[PDB]
């Protein structure tokens, strides 16, 4: 259930529902400010594709689902399955 997933994700600290990013860089789900999240997800997609190339340079049989981009303000969890890229903003605390 999509709504069940939304309720489960919003339970996490500092998380506003569930936002899912497509391969185009446009989030299929809308939870935060549209322009900022669209540009941020576009840069996210560029980096995650270039990191996919990174890993397949030496690991041509691996798949990416986990990455911890944390700063002193907030952490972004990025997770691709094959096309849907979950991005979650979570406080480091």
């Amino acid at each position: 259930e999509v709504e069940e997933t939304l309720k489960r994700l919003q339970s996490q600290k500092g998380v506003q529902g569930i936002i899912v990013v497509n391969t185009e860089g446009i989030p299929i789900k809308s939870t935060m400010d549209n322009p900022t999240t669209t540009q941020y997800a576009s840069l996210m997609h560029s980096f995650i594709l270039k990191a996919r190339s990174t890993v397949r340079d030496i690991d041509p049989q691996n798949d990416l689902t986990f990455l911890r981009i944390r700063s002193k303000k907030n952490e972004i969890m990025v997770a691709p399955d094959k096309d849907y890229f979950l991005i979650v903003i979570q406080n480091p605390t």
Binding site: T5, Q12, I18, T65, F66, M77, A79, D81
Partner: peptide
């Protein structure tokens, strides 16, 4: 995938 990543990021 979402369940696994959330339960591992709890």
């Amino acid at each position: 995938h979402s369940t696994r990543i959330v339960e591992r990021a709890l």
